[model samples]
Every structure is written in structure tokens, then in C-alpha cells.
Target chain A: SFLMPYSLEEQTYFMQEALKESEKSLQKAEIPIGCVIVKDGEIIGRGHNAREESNQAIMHAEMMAINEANAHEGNWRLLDTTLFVTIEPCVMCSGAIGLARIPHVIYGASNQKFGGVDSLYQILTDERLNHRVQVERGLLAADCANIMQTFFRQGRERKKIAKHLIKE
Target chain B: SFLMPYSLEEQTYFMQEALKESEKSLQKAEIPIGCVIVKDGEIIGRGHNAREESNQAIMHAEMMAINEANAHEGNWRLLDTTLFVTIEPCVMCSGAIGLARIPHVIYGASNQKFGGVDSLYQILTDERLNHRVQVERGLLAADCANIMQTFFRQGRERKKIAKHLIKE
Candidate 1:
């Protein structure tokens, strides 16, 4: 099971900075994605993907960075800090994050897109950690548009089908 | 002071029926208005104004039906029933409804467009009898487009003036 390698306070700062970088990169790419970085027990950065479909990718990249840092000294555990992503983290990855024992989360997405944060919040909260939420304004439409755009542009019908098949 | 002459239960039923009628009509007309009907006891019907700008109108009409019915019997006490309208009810009108001591509400509309439902939901849930919610899918965007159409058809100049006057 994944566990925090660092103290809660330190993780907050790390999460924040990571989120800030991710946000800038997403904006540069014109991909919509919500990002959050925690380090030293504070949110160092927070933002959303400029375009829709790329949010997951952006988030994954951020998470990967966090995980890589933890692995540097053979300390595979994540920090005690919690990452507050603007939208629901991708389901599979979110589960992995949970297993990593991230101590806190803040989601700014609505339930319509990813089954409201309640269920996810409940799971995280039940694990004996702090969790927060701030659903973004008009996220549903934006999410829908992003999905539609993906379907339209990907061209590979099988790829689109695979995307939906991933039960979140 | 706006009490219905009928028993609370009766009022609730009537309001629900009236709301149903209004929603049906709005739908037929292709207006994007969320519809909600309340009786003396519980919510009878709930829908979104399929057309956006018309939400206020539909809510007004529903309230009017409640008021008219209550007025018929010369009663002045508050109606005990509640209404469940999709989307947040207009704030100003919601206050009016609150003052009337409506004890139940179930909002389905998004709060960002109006005032967001959190504050309103909190108020009603804490102050009223019982409050429930169920957001109607895809109604927000549909309503927004409908409202935009109404504005465009009425002429951008007129709409702009109305906005300016309202702001002033």
C-alpha cells in the first residue's frame, strides 16, 4: 500500500508547486485540466485544464512527478500532504492515489461528470484524513464539450469506446 | 400573510398540478424553464425551464398559481407545502417564498447562473421542514441556449438596455 513518506506540512507545499507548474503547462497547450499541488502542508498551486480532454493527462503527469520524488531514496511512500485537484482525479488513478495514502483532497468538479464528489469524499474521509471540496462553476458543460471533442477528433472509434469502457 | 384557504395538503396537491401544467406548456412551447409544483405537504412536480430566460417566468407563474389559489379562500396563513424546481429558484423570489414560510424545497437548477443553490439550500434545509434535491440532466445548457435565443430574438440592443437598467 502507498503511504506518505513526508510529513503533512511538507507535502502541502510540494502539491501546490506541482499544481502551479501543471496549470501553466496545460494553459500553454490549450488543454483543459484542473491541477493542484501540495507541499509543506499548504497548497502551492491550483488551476484547471484550459481545454477539456487533456485534464486527465495533465493530472497524471503531476502525480507522476510527485511519485518520482518519493522514489528518489527508495521511499516509495507519498507525503502526508493531500492534493486538491479541481476535478475528480481519473478513477483508476484516484484509487491508486488513495492506496498511496494521500491524506487530503479537494475536488472542484460536480457529481454529474464523475458521480458527485460525495462517494469519493466519503471514501477518502473514512480513511481518517481531511478532505475538502470546491466544485467549479459550469464544469458539466465544459466536461461534456471536452468529451464530445475527443470523440470527434480521435477518429479511432475503438479508442473512444475504450475510453468509456474504463469504469470510473 | 399569503395563506391558502385549503388545508396544507390540498394546497400542495394544487400547486403540484399547476406546476405540472406549466411545465407541460413550457415544454410544448419549447421554452427552457425549470418547473416545480408544491402542494400543502410535498413536492408534486419538478422540471427545468427548458428555455433559460423563461425560468423566472415559469417560477412566477407557479407562485402565482399558489397565491391565486390561496387567495380564493381568503386565507392569509402561509402555505405549508414545498416546491422542488430544477435549478435554483430566483433569489429574490426565493426570499419571498421563504417569508411565506414554505417548509419544503427541492432545487434542481445550477446555482452559478442564479445565485448557486448552496446558500439557498442551506437556508431552506435549516429553516424549512424538509429539503431534497435532484438535478435534471442536460437542462442547464438547454436553458441557457433558450435564454440566449430569447435575448437575440428580442434584439441585442433591447437586451443590453435591460441589463444596463437592471444593473443600475
Candidate 2:
């Protein structure tokens, strides 16, 4: 859509990078989520989900990327920056995006369970906040969803087997 | 209310600790907000707003406290933890509280402009999220509000003078 900030090609390229990061999460059995921060056509930050590995609730992909990007720029306000992610950010990550002042967001898949921007709550664009974020969704949606679905499906199967073993 | 988890005396005491953190913020000219994380009558974590000083937008008082508490416990899920704040948490901080899995929250003042729990968007108790946080508002309201109002009043006056000087 013309309302979108980045070109479709640019969005796709960055999302592919995020997808690679998510694949790393798959190895760790963390949620298959990833994020990248771009500014002026260069990727300045990249991150995968580290909540499980880091044992920190704040280690979401978005938070990791935002922290890295902040360090890179030596400032917190990420003005004129765009964030790309494989999955829609949760409420916490979306809130971080708003706080970081990231201007544009592009996500590959919508997270029905915990999506904060477009699914569950719209914290970014609420008029009361000092900053508002523009979000574009569904770039390479199928691929991102594929990883997430696979993870959840396997997790469910494991839980079922564990319950069976317990009953036995 | 019967639904609240902590006693008024305990809540006020922890909030005073948070208020001390806010006093530190006032020294740095940051927003006079502060947070403390308590578990079993022990304050494991404390934070004051440092967004301006740190040049990081994600450094809300709530976030800072959550980070400290997480490190102190060596785990992300702060189960059975209580967060006390001098001002009602903003949307991002509230979301961080949910992600951190803090069970209870108490605030001294209501944040009319950007409160995420009761003021604007309620992300903590949204049924869709896997976790829900019980929140209590208005403890030591006058004192907390006094700090916040003073900061904003000074800020407004400074801006007015700056604008007047520009016009002159």
C-alpha cells in the first residue's frame, strides 16, 4: 500500500533476514521469533528470541534488537528507523517499539495469541502516547507462520506424550 | 478491596522505597517515576526513570526494576513477585510487568496521560494473554502526584519561556 513506508522489496528483504534469526530460535526451542532494525538502507541491529536461553522475560527479539540498535546509535530515540520481524510483537515488545520511537514496523506473520500491535491491543498508535508507530503486516506470512506452527505443534505433541507417560 | 493481595501497610512501605528511587530521578532531571520489586517482604530490585539520562526509551522504572529482579533471581519468571511504583506504569512498563509474570502491582498515583493498566489500554489482564496481573491503584497518591505535578509544571514553564524567547 502507498501508506507503507518501505518498498515491498525492501520489506521482504529485511523480513527474510529476520526469518533467518527465527530459525536460530528453533534450534533453542524458544519461540521462533526474530527481529532486525534498519536505518537508511542498512541493517544496524539483529536479534532472535532469547527468553528461554537467557532466562529473562525481557529477552524478546524486539527488545534485543532495540537494545543493540540503541547501542549502535548511542541514543535511545530511534528516529527514522524501521523494524522488521518474523512475528507480530507481543504487548511488551510493541510497547518497547513505541518507547524506542521506532517509526515503521513490518512483520511477516500476525500473532493471534499475543499480537500487541494489530491483534490484541493497539498500543503503538494510541493517541495518548507521545509516539505512534506505523505498522505493515503480512510480508512472507506463510514462511513465518510455518516456523511458528511447527514449534507449537511439536510442543503440543510433547505435552500429550508427557501426559500419557504420567498416566501410565 | 478483598481482591488486592498485599496489605496497605506493606504496599505503602514498598512504594516509599520506589519513591526514593524517584527522588534519584529528580536529581538527574529524568521523570520522577520509580519502581521496586518485592518478594517475601524483601526488595530485590529497585529502579528510577532513566530514559533521558540513559538515552534509552526502554529504560522505564518498571523495566529497570524487572531487569534487576530477574538478574537477582537468575530467572525471568518473577512468580509471586509484587511491583510497587510511585506512578502508575505506562503501557510499555505494564506490558513488561506482564511479560515478567509479576503477580501483583501497586501504584501510588494514577498516570492519566499514559497509564496502561487503568488509564488507557489494559494489556496485563487481557484474556488473550497467558498471564494476568492484579493491580491496585492510589497508594500515597498525594505525595507521588506532588512529584509528578512539580516536574510537569516546571517542564511547561520552561517550554513557555523557550517559546517566548524564540518569539522575541
Candidate 3:
């Protein structure tokens, strides 16, 4: 079965809904969050890390939509799936989505601040995923920053610390 | 400063010698190629399949000394430094070594039939790498037969395919 087809307006609405859902999840986990909106086969909104370091949950939310859609529908019609993300996807996720054959992606304001244009460009071009990002600097930025703050204050630091520790 | 502070006879006196060396490199390659030594570690023989289907290079002679003394110095200690190899190390090496932490690696075999285990294993372990393979075998005994036959007809196909696809 394929993902239900919808109009650009419908897609945008769905993206906003997804973002709302993601925000609720992040809040419950006390983590920062981001989101994206895809409509008419193009990204309308993207958001990430309003408060702390980029988390994969939001990044993968964007990817999950694409991958799940592809899995259900078979090959992704580049012209059909639009990406709406809150923050810039991580390099690893970017590489993965590129492989998944997503056509276009967009991000909210927060992505522009932390996710360098170069990194974004590299993923888009290298994987031939055909993506673009936009910045909504005012309220979106504040919201993202708030989430980041929560993540930094509450998230576990031991796992992160252990990663850098050399084994004796 | 070096490994094998003992004599070759002591260093490679058992199967562990080849297994140890192979594990260091093979683990990194991510491919599980079984290693066995007909003689004790004295001969220090090694082997790995270049392709997924082919029988491994049953005997890629790493070191064939008259006795352990000829392979290393009279002191087995040189075995610590003398990491003989039977096949070329994968371009992308993996795993933890000893206190010194330098990986012992070498590529001795010349056949293309044995170069792809690393990438294939990488793909298997890291779903992000590639997802073309089916989780389970498919129908069509004839097709399965063809694939199995390919292992015999062109044992090196995996390596050649990887060489063609992997960049750098």
C-alpha cells in the first residue's frame, strides 16, 4: 500500500500536525525538538534544536516519513514527497535519506543557524535527493531554542561522556 | 615498540595466532570468514573468501618457514612485530588491538575473489550502508541456483562489484 495522496495544502497541514506531535513527544521526554512540513511535493517548513544539540528523533521524524512512505508505496516519486523538517537532519541521516531517494526537503529557521549550508548542500547534491531549506527566524527560532535548553539541562550526559572516553 | 616478544614457535604454536590476527582485521572488515590452520600456528596459515558465495582462499600462506625459527628470529618475541598476512587488508579496517593500539594489517593475496567481505559486512551490520539484500531468501529455485552457481563460476564477483561501486 502507498501513502495516501494529498494536496499541497493538505501536506502542509499534515507536516504541521506532525510537528505538533513531535513537539508533544519532545516535551514529554523533556528534550528539544524540531519538525518539517512537506506539501505539493515540496518542503514548506522545517524546525530543529530550538533549545539544545540536534537530536536524531526530530531528524529521523523527517526521514521516517519518507522511508515509511517509500516502504509502503515502493519507490518514492521525487515529484510527490515534499520534506518539512524543523532542524537540519544529521549528516548520517542526510546520507541515509539521500539513499532513500527523497526529492525535496525544507527546514524551519533553527536549521540555518546550526546546520551549515555547506553540509546541507553536500548531502542534497551528493545523494541527488534534491532538497532545499528555508529559515523562519522569529518565533520558530525561539521555540527551538527553548527545546534545546530543556534537552541540555535534562538529557543524560554520561552516555555522551562515555563515547569520548578511551578504553583502558 | 613491537609485538611477539616470544619466538615464532611460541607465538604461533596454536590456531590462536592466525585467529588472533584475522580477528583483528576480519572483525574490522565486518565479514565473518572462518579461519583454520591444518598445522599448528607454526606455519601461521590464513584464509578468507573474497566473495560471499565462494569457498575461501582455503590456504593463503602467510608464513611458511622450515620451523618457527626461520619465520621469526630465534626469539619468538619477533612474532609480536611480524604480522604475516595472507590477504590484502580491507581499505576500511575495524576493531580494537592491544595496549599499543596500532592495528596489525597486511594484504598478501592477489585474487579479486577475496576483497569484498569488509564492505559486505559493513552493509549487513550498518543498515544505513545499504539495504538491497532481502532479509530472507526468495522463491524461484532456479534463480537461487543461478546465484549459488555464480559463487562457483565467479567467486570474485562480490569484490569486483564492490570495487566498481565504492568510491575511494
Candidate 4:
């Protein structure tokens, strides 16, 4: 009965919790996104980008949380749940979200380059999924975007780490 | 050019390298896969399952190499390039491959749930871009699929590792 108005104090509770998770993987990603999953106002699962750390590279914050929730031994239980992530997921994750059967997806930032909400859920067309997961974009823009900015800049600094592989 | 027929001898070279990459991370994978990028016989980029390691998992092996190659102060330099990996790419990586225009993508296995080779290039239409990246599936089924098979089996063992997550 409360929260959701551009995220009032209480509504932001989950986002903040997710942000805390993101802190664990700081500098662990190329974009450093964070994600949280909640069911009935209680936190079920949450995760942040962990690619830079290594094996988690194929993972996204949302997938991690989804996997976390699924690992809890429940399959369809994710339905009627809410997902809060720092960035609008790309196609890879959005597809995972759809198959995971989660009902809602809320994102903070929109990716100009790889945003897939329109292609996956919005702008309904052929090749669309049978179920349409509701989407709410732009949550805590300033704070979330601030965190993402650092991730955006992470690879551009020419950190000189490429000697191990590619030659400049 | 001669490495086409699955390359009985030469193909094993990359397979072994990929298997070594597979050793880096075991459990932290939804699909244990390894990818290696080669250009004109020169190994430019390669990586195995990095999910156990972190944000590296959200990325596929092809992507890791593509990013590595692109990050080297160049764009679209991967033309006529070849990618050797354990599994067919998902749309995210496929789209990236299309955009990157890498000439060939060779893999050890196919993803029935979400394969992207034919969907990405084979059955083309106006909605898809004109760039067609060649795809070769099942590079070394015995060795490559063996690793993938273990990764595939990892989640199904119903390991008591579950006081926290689902396995299916």
C-alpha cells in the first residue's frame, strides 16, 4: 500500500539493499550493475556484477539474484515477485528474466547502446514472449547512475592491462 | 581454411586450451563454457568459465575476446577472425558478434534452449542486418562436450549445497 512513487524512502529499501550487494563486486564489472529480488515486501535474493572477479563473468546482477532465489528450492515461487535492478537489462538478462517467470522488472538506468526492454517486452511484435513482464524504468536515477558511471569509465582508462592478451 | 571438417588434430589444440580455461572456475556456472579467439592463427583472446570468479561470467568467451580485441584501440578489426568456444552463443553474444562482424564462430556444442547461429544468420530477413557471420557447431564433441556435460551435470546432482538455492 506504500512505496513506488519514484521511490519514496520505504520503497528504496530494496534498492539500497541491492546497492549494498553491488558494493561487494565493485570494480568487478565492466558496468557494475546491481539487482534485488523481493517477494511480498521481504528480500528473497539479490546480487551485483561479479565478472571482474572471474568465473561470474557470464553472470549479471539480476541472474545472480534469480539463481539465488531458484537455488532456494522453489521453481514457480518467483511468480508474483518483484525484481529491482540498477540498470535496464540487456537481451541476455531480459530473456533470463522472462524464462525465470518473474512478473515485474524495475530498472534504474536505461542503456542507450544495449537496452532490450523495448525489443524483449515492449513494442510487442513477433518473436515476443508469450508472457509480458511489466517493466518500470528509471529508479533512483542520480544514485544508481552515479554508481554506473564509474563502471562505464572502468574500461576506457586504457589501464594498460591488455599486455597479457591484445596488443595496442 | 583447411581447419573446417572439425579439424581432427588441429582442433584438439584449442580444445585442450579451452579445457584448461575451464579449470579456472567449476561450480559458478549455469553453463560451463570456454571461448578462445584466434585471428590468422594468432591467439588474440581466450578465457574459460569465470563465473566462480565474478563479473567475468556475465560475459561469454566470444564476447570477452571481442571486447579484448576491440579494446585494443581498434573497432571491427576482428573481420575474418575465428572464435573457438564450447557452446553456441546466446542472442546477446550473437548480436555482439554480428555487430563485430567476426567472420567465423566455431563452437563445441549447440544450445537447443537458446542457440543463436541459425537464428542469427541462417534464416535471415529484413529485420536482421546484412552482415552474416559464419557459424560452425560442435568443434570437439568428445572433449568439449565432456566439460560442458560436467557443467551440465553440476546443477542436477541435487547436491545438499541447497540450504540456499534451487538446482533445476
Minimal lDDT window, size 10, model 2 chain A: A1-10
lDDT (0 to 1) per candidate: 0.41, 0.87, 0.36, 0.62
**Candidate 4, B8-108: lDDT as tens digits:** 56666876666666655454554567777766666667765543343332345666666676554255456767777777765546655655557677777
Q: What is the lDDT of residue A129 in candidate 2?
A: 84
Task: Provide DockQ values for all models, in the order shown.
Answer: 0.01, 0.68, 0.03, 0.08
* Candidate with more favorable, higher DockQ: 1 or 2: 2
lDDT head-to-head 2 vs 3, winner: 2
lDDT of 2 by residue, A51-163 (tens): 87887788889988998898888899899899999989888888889888898888988988888888887777777785667788888999999999898988898899999
lDDT per residue as tens, model 3, A40-92: 54443343332122222122354345434443444433334555555555443
Least accurate stretch of 10 residues (summed lDDT) in model 2 chain B? B1-10
Q: lDDT score, residue A45, model 3?
A: 36
Q: Write the per-residue lDDT of candidate 1 for residues A1-168, one digit (tens) a residue.
A: 444445544544443444454455444543333445455644433444432232222123324433443443234344454555534554323433444445555444433333213532232332232222222223233443453355345446656677889954
The number of the candidate with the highest DockQ is 2
Evaluation by TM-score, superior candidate among 2 and 3: 2
Highest TM-score among the candidates is held by which one?
2
Q: Taking the true A–B contacts (Cα pairs closer than 8 Å), what share appears in each candidate?
A: 0.00, 0.66, 0.00, 0.05
Regarding DockQ, does 1 or 4 come out ahead? 4
**What is the descending DockQ order?**
2, 4, 3, 1
Task: Please give, as one word, the docking class of candidate 4.
Answer: incorrect
Real contacts retained, model 4: 0.05
Better of 3 and 4 by TM-score: 4
Cα error, residue B36 of model 4, in Å, equals 13
Query: What would the per-residue lDDT of candidate 1 be over residues B86-134, giving only the tens digit for each residue?
Result: 3455432343344344554444334544332353223233223222322
